[model samples]
Target: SPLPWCPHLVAVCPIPAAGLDVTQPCGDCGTIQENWVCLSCYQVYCGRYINGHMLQHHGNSGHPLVLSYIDLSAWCYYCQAYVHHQALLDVKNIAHQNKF
Candidate 1:
């Protein structure tokens, strides 16, 4: 499927110099470079793992953490789930306007 709305596409880590390790492993057979992001928990998965993981880890706990992707529809590196790019844009805009 095409991720036309993934945020990772245009999302930039505030600390680029901190450098992200894309080579990290994602799930049982995936890798970060393949398209995944680490959630606060530091677990790795893929976009395909979203629903399952959410149901398993998140459940009804009302965890604020959700799948965050690159460029909008991209997968979250830590959680390995699809994310909405609009969210990232909002984050960027807020950070930009609030920058001292």
Candidate 2:
């Protein structure tokens, strides 16, 4: 399920990704609860569990944007908020279709 729509998120995300999937392994750690994709390079990684590669990726690469595989939400490091976008809708459909 996606979060409520936010104009700011959509406005900034001119190019939205297809989102992440649970079946895929975390980009850094093998175990994961939720997954996120680095929109800058589109790599899927684990959330705030295990290796915390998502944050690591941002710290090193400075690629601030990521898309949620858990709830189809968008995250922005610059604004430090979960930005909303049509990508969330695409991810929502993927989740629903996959029965996640």
Candidate 3:
């Protein structure tokens, strides 16, 4: 079910490192996964996950989890699309601004 309260959309990125206080070694490869790289694609997992399935095999890279709001739009850096919510505010506010 959709969340209650404001129905506005918001952008989100998967950053496993975010949950922790500091950057640590990659539990899977033992080599530290620096700069929040996707354990699955091995490419820099910035913005959004191509698919949740990517993070299955990886043990502790914290794959499959969304990083956080890195960009304004919820476009998948891997696949440009209007997926996540970029911002949240009153719809009326938007209408009012258009008057200017």
Candidate 4:
């Protein structure tokens, strides 16, 4: 279930050009699929499968929130679930503009 608010939600700046690029691979590994954009820093990384760069990112930076590049959904690494809040609307719009 999606949470009304995310505890670790940080003030996210606009995403970079490469952040929305589906062709762009993970920052640590070269895998293309299951990539998530870290809301805190807008860094792209793969999910727990293929490589767990996103999780590793949380471990390193303590940036708990990520937006799925595949689906444009927000997730919280700390809470380990989907998160929905007004603050996330911008990122979703950014991804949606590029996608649609």
TM-score of each predicted structure versus truth? 0.31, 0.64, 0.24, 0.86
Tens-digit per-residue lDDT, 1-100, candidate 1: 5343543434333323333343445455554433344433434344444334433443433232333333323344434454545545544343334332
What's model 4's TM-score? 0.86
* Model 1 misplacement above 4 A: 1-19, 31-34, 49-100
Model 1, C-alpha of 52: deviation from truth (Å):
5.9
Q: Candidate 3: where is the Cα deviation over 4 Å? A: 1-19, 35-54, 58-63, 68-100
User: How would you order the candidates by TM-score, starting with the best?
Assistant: 4, 2, 1, 3
Q: lDDT values of the candidates?
A: 0.40, 0.64, 0.29, 0.82
Best by TM-score: 4
lDDT of 4 by residue, 1-100 (tens): 5898866766566667654665568999888889988888888899887699999998999887888888888888778889988888877887877767
Q: Tell me how far the alpha carbon of residue 94 in candidate 1 is from the true structure, in angstroms, after superposition.
A: 16
User: RMSD in angstroms, all models?
Assistant: 9.7, 4.2, 12.4, 2.0
Across 1-73, the per-residue lDDT of candidate 2 in tens digits comes to 3335444344333333444354666877766557777766777777775678888888888777777766666
Best to worst by lDDT, what's the order?
Answer: 4, 2, 1, 3
TM-score of 1: 0.31
lDDT of each residue in 1-100, candidate 3, tens digit only:
2222222222223333323221333334433233233322333332214332323333344333222222222223333233333232222123234322
| Candidate 1 backbone overlaps, count | 24
